[PDB]
Amino acid sequence: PLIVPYNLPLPGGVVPRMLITILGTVKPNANRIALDFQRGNDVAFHFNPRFNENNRRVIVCNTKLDNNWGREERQSVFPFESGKPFKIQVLVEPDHFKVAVNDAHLLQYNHRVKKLNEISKLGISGDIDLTSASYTMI
Ligand SMILES: CN(C(=O)[C@@H]1O[C@H](CO)[C@H](O)[C@H](n2cc(-c3cc(F)c(F)c(F)c3)nn2)[C@H]1O)c1cc(Cl)cc(Cl)c1
Numbered sequence: 001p002l003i004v005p006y007n008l009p010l011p012g013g014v015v016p017r018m019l020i021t022i023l024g025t026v027k028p029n030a031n032r033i034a035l036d037f038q039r040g041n042d043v044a045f046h047f048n049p050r051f052n053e054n055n056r057r058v059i060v061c062n063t064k065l066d067n068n069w070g071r072e073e074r075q076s077v078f079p080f081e082s083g084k085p086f087k088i089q090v091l092v093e094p095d096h097f098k099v100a101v102n103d104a105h106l107l108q109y110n111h112r113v114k115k116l117n118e119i120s121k122l123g124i125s126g127d128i129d130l131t132s133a134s135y136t137m138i
Pocket residue numbers: 032033034046048060061062069070071072125126127
């Protein structure tokens with residue numbers, strides 16, 4: 001297993017055709033999970049499942065620039081379930097990050113941070129038992 005919060009360096013940033021795979025299990029009674037692709041202190045892509053936001057389950061996506069969050073992108077579809085194993089796959093594409101959960105397409109997030117070669121970290125945080133975090137070129 002891996003220790004959470006987890007820091008996975010992405011040497012030289014991300015590039016199109018780069019596939020990142022996170023394997024884990026959501027804790028029972030989980031409240032939140034967050035993936036943070038970072039460009040220094042900026043968060044290029046924050047992918048944040050929320051298990052209880054006003055008693056609803058929602059995925060919140062955003063970008064943080066100079067310490068300020070931007071305009072959120074919300075997804076009704078919520079594939080996660082407390083206490084169950086999951087797989088998140090983030091495929092870096094020319095115009096967006098493509099997220100699939102448990103082999104099902106979930107969302108696309110357009111690149112607001114254009115310097116892909118500077119998004120050199122993925123942080124993994126939240127109410128999970130983290131099993132594996134890696135990348136490969138497809
Ligand atoms: C109300 N409000 C929010 O709730 C913020 O929305 C942001 C996305 O828009 C981030 O999700 C922020 N966030 C989550 C986490 C986090 C940390 C962990 F360690 C986790 F394990 C985890 F799962 C998640 N860290 N930061 C969240 O505070 C907010 C919104 C805007 Cl747009 C502006 C402001 Cl000023 C506040």
